[PDB]
Design a protein around this ligand. Structure first.
Ligand SMILES: *[C@@H]1O[C@H](CO)[C@@H](O[C@@H]2O[C@H](CO)[C@@H](O[C@@H]3O[C@H](CO)[C@@H](O)[C@H](O)[C@@H]3O)[C@H](O)[C@H]2NC(C)=O)[C@H](O)[C@H]1NC(C)=O
Ligand SMILES: *[C@@H]1O[C@H](CO)[C@@H](O[C@@H]2O[C@H](CO)[C@@H](O)[C@H](O)[C@H]2NC(C)=O)[C@H](O)[C@H]1NC(C)=O
Ligand SMILES: *[C@@H]1O[C@H](CO)[C@@H](O[C@@H]2O[C@H](CO)[C@@H](O)[C@H](O)[C@H]2NC(C)=O)[C@H](O)[C@H]1NC(C)=O
Ligand SMILES: *[C@@H]1O[C@H](CO)[C@@H](O[C@@H]2O[C@H](CO)[C@@H](O)[C@H](O)[C@H]2NC(C)=O)[C@H](O)[C@H]1NC(C)=O
Ligand SMILES: *[C@@H]1O[C@H](CO)[C@@H](O[C@@H]2O[C@H](CO)[C@@H](O)[C@H](O)[C@H]2NC(C)=O)[C@H](O)[C@H]1NC(C)=O
Ligand SMILES: *[C@@H]1O[C@H](CO)[C@@H](O[C@@H]2O[C@H](CO)[C@@H](O)[C@H](O)[C@H]2NC(C)=O)[C@H](O)[C@H]1NC(C)=O
Ligand SMILES: *[C@@H]1O[C@H](CO)[C@@H](O[C@@H]2O[C@H](CO)[C@@H](O)[C@H](O)[C@H]2NC(C)=O)[C@H](O)[C@H]1NC(C)=O
Ligand SMILES: *[C@@H]1O[C@H](CO)[C@@H](O[C@@H]2O[C@H](CO)[C@@H](O)[C@H](O)[C@H]2NC(C)=O)[C@H](O)[C@H]1NC(C)=O
Ligand SMILES: *[C@@H]1O[C@H](CO)[C@@H](O[C@@H]2O[C@H](CO)[C@@H](O)[C@H](O)[C@H]2NC(C)=O)[C@H](O)[C@H]1NC(C)=O
Ligand SMILES: *[C@@H]1O[C@H](CO)[C@@H](O[C@@H]2O[C@H](CO)[C@@H](O)[C@H](O)[C@H]2NC(C)=O)[C@H](O)[C@H]1NC(C)=O
Ligand SMILES: *[C@@H]1O[C@H](CO)[C@@H](O[C@@H]2O[C@H](CO)[C@@H](O)[C@H](O)[C@H]2NC(C)=O)[C@H](O)[C@H]1NC(C)=O
Ligand SMILES: *[C@@H]1O[C@H](CO)[C@@H](O[C@@H]2O[C@H](CO)[C@@H](O)[C@H](O)[C@H]2NC(C)=O)[C@H](O)[C@H]1NC(C)=O
Ligand SMILES: *[C@@H]1O[C@H](CO)[C@@H](O[C@@H]2O[C@H](CO)[C@@H](O)[C@H](O)[C@H]2NC(C)=O)[C@H](O)[C@H]1NC(C)=O
Ligand SMILES: *[C@@H]1O[C@H](CO)[C@@H](O)[C@H](O)[C@H]1NC(C)=O
Ligand SMILES: *[C@@H]1O[C@H](CO)[C@@H](O)[C@H](O)[C@H]1NC(C)=O
Ligand SMILES: *[C@@H]1O[C@H](CO)[C@@H](O)[C@H](O)[C@H]1NC(C)=O
Ligand SMILES: *[C@@H]1O[C@H](CO)[C@@H](O)[C@H](O)[C@H]1NC(C)=O
Ligand SMILES: *[C@@H]1O[C@H](CO)[C@@H](O)[C@H](O)[C@H]1NC(C)=O
Ligand SMILES: *[C@@H]1O[C@H](CO)[C@@H](O)[C@H](O)[C@H]1NC(C)=O
Lengths: 342, 169, 168, 341, 341, 170
């Protein structure tokens, strides 16, 4: 008899590409990819994941906390991974800010980029020795404190000239010292109050526009105040006010000082942020539901099965599948053969 | 593949070969018997399995947001960051596509090499009285129906079962 | 390659083999006849053609300018954008060179495998009276001049034409 | 006789690299690369390609159009691909600008980065209710309109205090509202006029330097005017003028307002640009002649043959060959063999 | 007898990964990687390597040289490779600067990014025709020149109003011309002096804060001076002074002018830097000891053996090994086999 | 490998084969003689050497600092530059790992192909009177001891030295 070597013949619906034979049908494949489906965001497995800056600060937005709004101070956990859930953060209390006249909205998003975030215990500037005659610190009904008394953003001091000091001044300069610990960035919050013509003179003895200038790390910023005719209060405490404040932040790298040149209405920095390390940040939404191998900006929380995935590529952190252009298959069978003429 | 095509190996296949990918056929008075070789099939499956593990070992860096670049204030920087992510995705994907292509290339081409190895298994069992044709076939002095072929695939066939001479182990 | 070198395959080549890359020579009283095998040459050419198509399938993203980054105002960003482009070019280029290298590696290496396949084609046609040496050669009982060799290359050679046995 | 398997022997001048045998000669290769030659730029096949912002604005530079120079208003076609043909865009008419004192030159290059570009039909600020007393709008002989009457950049309003209002002012603040449609960026053009002491007093009732400050998306810019002793007129209408203007632009993201703090001589924004989508931009030159698979910053328009190319790597868009360091070959033949003895 | 083909069997402690057989033991490997050890930095082999900007300016810091401190003028050699040894450059003499109020510290680091660095021989502004009345140039004991007479930073001119000109001025504007050669960047150094109320009145006839504004390539910067209550003198000559200066730089691309708007205390630019080409820059330390194939920010100078290295990836220039995640081996032997039965 | 495993090649190895990686064994009354084939071992070594040179030819661009981006002033840009360096390092590393993997795959896989080539060298020397089994072994009519086996490995073995027929050489 004649005994020969042979290869099977079976249903071969699967196709793979080869270098030397082009596309070929095969009896079986191992799929290397899946297309994920959109899910809720979640905690990253093996890593505590930051959402809100201060989780236990209820009825407080991240921007509220970052500005040091009264009643909005609390434990701020360190985190190696953070979720950016507000592309344009809003306030929900305290004195009315004209937010979009500065970069201030992104301040909490800047903070969450650090692993460790803490507020300083000391004031970075002494209101009692600050340039521009003698001051008293102002308070407001829009900012009730922890004993429910009238207060203000803990990051700032609303200084109002004493009765012997109700007069216009030349722009005076204050040096803002670095008071944070080794390796920490200092993020200094400051601004200026303004009002209509009548209130300006009562408070400051000057109803002309006031000018303000900051300098840090080669970056200079210049502002000129507005006297009356303000846009309406928004994202605030809800108590009617005739004035508005403008708020800004100033980043000071380790051992670096900043300066603020100012006139009337200045909000001097007090408590400053001290921050170190890096937190890994992606866009997501709240609340974080459950646990996942991987956080993905398009698909939210997902667990890893296949080594690769197809679909919408986006930023992702954790134990993630690697994005590929096409649904790759690994051949697990033989190239198609027509049945032999027996 | 190209080897079999040039060597005159049978280009067709055997639907009856269901227990495996590779094996033997027997042609005689019985008609045509077909048996799969499990050893050859297992070896092929194991190679593919190791290849799967190898492809699954790849680790690449996560792409996340810049910690310093703020929305609106740093949109120009953010556009460049977007481009960096996109090009990374593009480049690594094509690298993976190359790796998978070469894997499948190896897997498909190795078919004829299994046949060549199955020739060597067959030849030794058939003993010195069998005649090697060259196209993957052997001419035997004895009959070999399905019962015989099964013993070949299982590696239990002895030429002594027809009082023919054997290669001693 | 290394196989032929160890196996004792002829390391030289035949200028008379013009119709193909691979084939047969016959050595006897006629001198030396040479015939190219068209099937083996076609197979090699087709593999290379498919390999060309595979290499040509690669698509990568266009590199263009940033829409937001303005000249002079954003030169620092633009320097980095330039760097990103250069590194992309560098990396993909080196990936392509690797892909082409492995392709050429395959094509050159497959030569001895073609010779090994031509052995099987030759062996079956020559019949059981021919003796396989191992170095890619067979000793025949009959004479085979160019007219004969052409019939081998063409696959029409029969051993009965010399009253010699065939594989039935 | 002896019948053997064999390999041909032919002239083998071509060389390829291998992993295990180093470089080897071969009888034939398929070249995978070419070196392109510099050609004119062209239309990208299958894609409308933007050169000039406004094709129907004849005798108008892109910067002319972007500033709203009179006689230079028209349709700005959308385009997914745009050619940057001016690294430092120039004006060719209207009132003398001191260009290099701001970022204004790049304004049309900023615009072409968008797929869709349109000018607003309404004014973003009403000059008659604008802070700083009552105004009249100024015009100039340098800016003749479509009926050759005195005009001005349509993107701005040269506001001049009325005769009962010729007085210095403290810096006043105006909010520039977002007036564009969903998803569009608003690009606000504005500036300030200045002159010698005499004209300054006649026009504004103040000959001191005036100060101007803008704020948008966290970006603040501050300018101080110059009184007389100006640099010489360039890129303008050619009509002699004693004054100069400084012009700037302000990008406003969707739903975002900006502010301008100003004194005398202010050029208030009027018509603003509304822009959306992204256009793919590369450096090139005009005119676009014919059609091509690929636009390449060094080689201009080119069609794709070989899968790869050698030479000068640069930005390129369309159906392009991929750049490689070396002229790669695919082996199409056999390794060299000496003629058999 | 029976003759068979066989493979050796030996001790196989080395492991490599394969695609189809997983990890396997082998009789021998060729190591492809090493972990370098931290070493001193060195000159890049075949390439002049910049450390100090001015090698022949002894007891001069890079920032001293960049500001044109007296006695710190000299040849600044071109270099295609440069070492950044000061992340925050300091001065070591001359008049007390309030460094951190501007970006001025990074100026020498900016310069070293260019292949070619030279100081202009002519002044970019004539102090005798500069806006703001007639001037005399100030000098200081803090800045002794090469004959130990009182001097000042050669990049600037401390202009002080004449005794008949001690009066306040509105901010005046000066254009800073481009005076460099084809293709060169111009880096303009300028600033302003300030003092306590008493000296301000003596020197300038005004004790109010003075304001300064610069504009170049769309970049504007605004400063307001401080009157008295200065921080302590640091990084200066050590001679006690009541005043302080603030210093800034201004980059002017080829053919570009800049402007400076200023009042009293201005330090007008004089000699400017002209720079061209690119130098390859990495962080390192001084002195450069010996020669090396490769400069690595973590390992310093290292010579190349293996094609790859494992360890701390960082910026590196020259003939360097390529970083890999794991210690790769090339198989150089046979897969392990147990001894034959 | 898989070929030898299916073909029934000996899965063990020979400790006595010290002069080379590949060669021959002979089994008879003398016991078992072992000789390494130097040509086969050399060929493998040359391939590995060429593969080493090929891997060493790879050149990639240096990663250095941006010339324009200044510390503190341009920290946002500098963070992105760090990311670019990190991703370059990551990507090229995995590409190199793939190249080395494929190299080692080739080297290990080539073993059985060396054995198949050694069969052809052996077969021609043994002459037409020897019988090919298929598992890499040959049955000879003659004795072949260590002195004999060494002559096989050296390519000097002649079948006429046992009065057996030879393939006449060309
Ligand atoms: C929460 O806010 C309340 C204010 O609503 C803070 O209590 C108040 O603090 C001010 C300033 O220290 C007190 O005014 C002082 O009064 C004395 C005489 O009584 C006078 O000599 C001082 O010069 C100053 O004017 C005020 O009496 C005090 N209490 C109230 C009811 O207003 C409170 O400290 C805040 N708590 C926290 C935790 O911030
Ligand atoms: C090879 O695989 C392809 C893809 O699965 C098969 O083509 C499909 O055949 C089905 C019939 O069941 C059709 O409904 C699809 O429309 C086909 N798709 C394409 C893209 O052609 C093909 O039949 C397979 N060939 C063999 C021999 O099995
Ligand atoms: C990803 O996997 C985790 C488990 O590792 C899932 O969390 C589990 O959820 C089920 C209910 O759905 C619970 O009973 C388990 O106790 C959870 N385990 C842990 C460790 O939390 C998670 O739901 C998965 N997520 C996705 C998107 O698949
Ligand atoms: C590759 O395909 C083979 C079959 O061709 C799979 O092996 C079989 O798996 C089934 C389970 O579904 C078992 O019942 C069989 O005994 C296996 N062996 C055979 C049929 O010979 C194998 O699992 C596939 N590979 C992977 C990674 O899934
Ligand atoms: C292999 O190819 C190389 C490169 O084409 C050949 O070397 C060239 O030979 C020509 C003519 O002899 C010279 O003019 C060139 O200068 C050589 N090139 C180099 C780089 O030296 C070589 O001759 C070819 N070898 C064979 C056997 O054909
Ligand atoms: C172009 O030129 C002048 C502007 O100087 C415009 O003429 C004004 O037209 C309105 C309405 O017809 C009259 O009420 C004014 O009295 C005209 N002013 C002057 C100075 O003649 C003319 O309308 C402009 N045309 C445009 C803008 O299309
Ligand atoms: C431009 O041409 C003008 C006249 O159109 C030239 O006149 C200058 O004007 C200033 C005014 O302050 C005076 O100093 C002199 O009349 C001229 N100065 C110089 C240096 O020549 C002037 O030369 C040209 N360049 C400018 C104005 O920058
Ligand atoms: C690229 O190819 C196009 C063809 O697709 C060329 O355009 C053609 O040019 C010929 C020459 O006169 C005309 O007859 C055709 O009508 C043109 N066709 C089209 C669609 O324009 C084009 O010139 C080529 N360009 C380059 C740079 O090679
Ligand atoms: C690779 O080279 C071969 C020759 O070695 C080319 O084959 C030639 O092609 C022509 C038609 O183009 C046919 O007549 C024959 O197949 C060959 N001619 C001769 C005279 O031998 C083949 O075309 C090349 N492959 C590619 C893709 O270019
Ligand atoms: C294959 O190589 C591995 C790695 O060198 C060997 O495993 C080591 O064996 C030594 C004994 O000398 C132990 O001290 C190590 O702890 C082992 N390490 C690991 C990771 O297993 C293994 O013995 C080798 N196998 C053979 C057959 O040689
Ligand atoms: C270095 O030293 C002094 C700087 O004070 C310069 O000599 C001055 O030259 C003026 C000429 O107008 C004379 O009043 C004195 O000779 C010096 N001035 C004073 C106030 O004493 C000298 O030119 C400087 N430069 C050098 C030496 O290159
Ligand atoms: C790298 O390059 C060379 C290696 O030869 C070294 O330069 C020599 O080092 C010796 C020993 O220290 C000294 O004679 C000189 O420094 C050099 N000699 C000559 C003749 O140039 C260099 O030190 C090596 N550096 C490292 C870190 O390996
Ligand atoms: C790979 O290993 C082989 C042997 O395992 C090395 O070749 C031997 O090593 C040295 C050469 O320096 C001598 O002792 C032997 O004579 C060599 N030849 C043999 C054993 O046949 C070879 O050097 C290694 N490859 C590399 C690149 O180091
Ligand atoms: C607030 O209301 C006033 C009139 O009551 C109007 O002028 C102004 O535009 C409003 N602004 C907002 C933000 O609602
Ligand atoms: C095959 O032959 C053997 C012995 O003659 C025996 O099993 C039977 O006759 C045959 N079996 C089949 C299935 O044909
Ligand atoms: C070869 O074989 C036959 C012998 O008769 C004939 O066709 C032919 O003439 C012979 N000679 C040559 C040179 O082909
Ligand atoms: C417009 O073009 C004409 C000729 O086409 C030319 O004379 C003129 O200078 C151009 N510019 C203006 C402003 O007319
Ligand atoms: C500043 O200098 C004075 C004068 O020597 C000295 O007494 C004081 O301690 C210094 N303070 C600081 C913070 O350096
Ligand atoms: C083989 O070894 C034997 C001893 O076992 C001895 O005859 C001689 O050394 C070798 N053979 C010949 C023919 O010399």
């Amino acid at each position: 008899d004649r005994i020969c070597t042979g290869i099977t013949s079976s249903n071969s619906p699967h196709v793979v590409k080869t270098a030397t034979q082009g596309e070929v049908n095969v009896t079986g494949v191992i799929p290397l990819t899946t297309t994920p489906t959109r899910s809720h965001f979640a905690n990253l497995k093996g890593t505590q994941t930051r959402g809100k800056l201060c989780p236990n600060c209820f009825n407080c937005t991240d921007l509220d906390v970052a500005l040091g709004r009264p009643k909005c101070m609390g434990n701020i956990p360190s985190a190696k991974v953070s979720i950016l859930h507000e592309v344009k953060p809003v306030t929900s209390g305290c004195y009315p800010i004209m937010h979009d006249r500065t970069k201030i909205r992104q301040l909490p998003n800047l903070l969450r980029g650090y692993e460790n975030i803490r507020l300083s215990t000391s004031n970075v500037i002494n209101t009692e020795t600050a340039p521009g005659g003698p001051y008293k610190v102002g308070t407001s009904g829009s900012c009730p404190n922890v004993t429910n008394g009238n207060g203000f953003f803990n990051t700032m001091a609303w200084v109002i000239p004493k009765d012997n000091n109700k007069i216009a001044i030349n722009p005076v300069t204050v040096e803002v010292p670095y008071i944070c610990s080794e390796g920490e960035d200092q993020i200094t919050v400051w601004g200026f109050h303004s009002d209509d013509k009548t209130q300006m003179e009562r408070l400051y003895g000057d109803s002309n526009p006031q000018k303000f200038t900051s300098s840090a790390n080669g970056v200079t910023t210049h502002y000129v105040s507005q006297i009356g005719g303000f846009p309406n209060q928004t994202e605030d405490e809800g108590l009617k006010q005739s004035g508005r404040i403008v708020v800004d932040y100033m980043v000071q790298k380790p051992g670096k000082t900043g300066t603020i040149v100012y006139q009337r209405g200045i909000l001097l920095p007090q408590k400053v942020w001290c921050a170190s390390g890096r937190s890994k940040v992606i866009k997501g939404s709240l609340p974080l539901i459950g646990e996942a191998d991987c956080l993905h900006e398009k698909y939210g929380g997902l667990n890893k099965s296949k080594p690769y995935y197809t679909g919408e590529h986006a930023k992702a952190i954790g134990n993630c599948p690697i994005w590929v252009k096409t649904p790759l298959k690994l051949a697990n069978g033989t190239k198609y053969r027509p049945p032999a003429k027996l | 593949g190209f080897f079999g095509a040039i060597a005159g190996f049978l280009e067709g296949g055997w639907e009856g070969m269901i227990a495996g990918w590779h094996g033997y056929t027997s042609h005689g008075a019985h008609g045509v018997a077909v048996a799969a070789d499990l050893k050859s099939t297992q070896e092929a499956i194991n190679k593919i399995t190791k290849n799967l593990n190898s492809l699954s070992e790849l680790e690449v860096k996560n792409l996340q947001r810049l910690s310093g670049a703020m929305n609106e204030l740093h949109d120009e920087i953010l556009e460049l960051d977007e481009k960096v992510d996109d090009l990374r995705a593009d480049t690594i994907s094509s690298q993976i596509e190359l790796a998978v292509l070469l894997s499948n290339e190896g897997i498909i081409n190795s078919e004829d090499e299994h046949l060549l190895a199955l020739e060597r298994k067959l030849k030794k069992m058939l003993g010195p009285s069998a005649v090697e044709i060259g196209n993957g076939c052997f001419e035997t002095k004895h009959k070999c129906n399905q019962t015989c072929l099964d013993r070949i695939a299982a590696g239990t066939f002895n030429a002594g079962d027809f009082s023919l001479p054997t290669f001693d182990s």
